[model samples]
Target: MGSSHHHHHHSSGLVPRGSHMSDEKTQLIEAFYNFDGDYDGFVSVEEFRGIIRDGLPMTEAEITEFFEAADPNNTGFIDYKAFAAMLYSVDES
Candidate 1:
């Protein structure tokens, strides 16, 4: 939603940010990307957030703001759905 959309997903679904990529990354990629529904190329932060909200029952705006913090690269414009897959369950480390 900004300069450019994400090309490669850096956050692993289960990694919880800054975490190493193990089975968690693989599973998260599978789940996150699959839900991506073949958007431009990378999964928008907004879309990722939505799915996460359904699972966690949180507000989209809340999720959006949370991810906006981590999205330092400004990969793309995400509302809530997109942010979820990346920001959810952050390790807070």
Candidate 2:
């Protein structure tokens, strides 16, 4: 059987990529650190695409949706907590 190794999770779905399962949070943290290129502590819109997406075909609208979810405060970036919480539904306060 083929592995679900390259699953592409949508922001609205809040699904973990691949079989990260219980380790999804840790994977997300590592991904965040990698995406935060300059280590400035936040992932900018550009970084979200340039580094995180890393050559994958992601539309601007899709990216905007992701930002809308992750950066709800509209601070123009995503902090660690916010980024990590992306896997959770926003309504679950």
Candidate 3:
């Protein structure tokens, strides 16, 4: 008997919802820096809202409404954790 054992937790092997979150992060980051500005992590609400300002290229108004839905919780600001959770929540798998 050694110190190591073969006890597995048998989880679903999934992050419960992070794949889409990662994708969203990439997209949001892309949108944030659409003009190819900087490499710092100091993104503000105004900067992010700029991404949704003129509407998405291939999307309709309704499709782009959620970004600024005026939710009390959202408060027009999306921190990293909240933003990540939003994308993850939408992820079916």
TM agreement with the true structure for every prediction: 0.30, 0.39, 0.30
Best by lDDT: 2
1-93 per-residue lDDT for model 2 (tens digits): 254344543443555545555453444455535554556556566566665465334456645777777777776776645654555533564
Residues 1-93, model 3: lDDT tens digits: 353333332234444554443554445444444634563433344555565455223233432354454233555554434434553565575
lDDT of 3 at 32: 45
Best by TM-score: 2
lDDT for each of the candidates? 0.52, 0.56, 0.44
Better of 2 and 3 by lDDT: 2
Extract clashing residue pairs from model 2.
none
Q: Model 2 — TM-score against the truth? A: 0.39
Q: Which model is ahead, 2 or 3, in terms of TM-score?
A: 2
- Local error of candidate 2 at residue 9 (angstroms): 29
Candidate 1 lDDT score at position 69 = 61
Residue 11 of model 1, lDDT score: 39
lDDT of 1 by residue, 1-93 (tens): 352334333334344536454444444454544465555534566666665555444454655565676466667555444444453554566
Q: Could you give the C-alpha RMSD of every candidate to the true structure, in order shown?
A: 16.5, 10.7, 9.8
